[PDB]
Amino acid sequence: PSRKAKVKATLGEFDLRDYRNVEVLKRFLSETGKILPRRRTGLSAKEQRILAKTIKRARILGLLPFTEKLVRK
């Protein structure tokens, strides 16, 4: 379905290769640290890809989560 917003527009001008811009990247993960499906991040095939490697790169530095507990429910 995906009937809400779109992490693409719900943001501004930024660098996908930025593995230290926590506040922005944070935006690309669900309630759970799982990286976002492209058909949600609104990115392209080539962006969604850089982003990915960026995120995963940052997780290692300890700035982003590898996994979170699903609240609500």
Binding site: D15, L16, R17, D18, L61, G62, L64, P65
Partner: protein
Amino acid sequence: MRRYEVNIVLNPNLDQSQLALEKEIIQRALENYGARVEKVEELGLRRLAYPIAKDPQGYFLWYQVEMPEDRVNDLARELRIRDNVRRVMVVKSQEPFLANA
């Protein structure tokens, strides 16, 4: 010489006594292999996403040298033998590919 970046997340519960005492060793090894200073940021304490080395916080030390390729990996060997240095991520610099800019 190739341009690299040397992310370093070390012990948050560290005093200015050894903090500066570990930043001298870092500079030592750095220039002992060939690293050359440049745009450096010492952001400082930050709450990690997950507990590291038992502690839920880290002191980040981001650099940007430009050392010899065939040396890099060595610049990482001796840069980890420290005990307060709990993370070392050196990764080649690459022009920021914007998007939605």
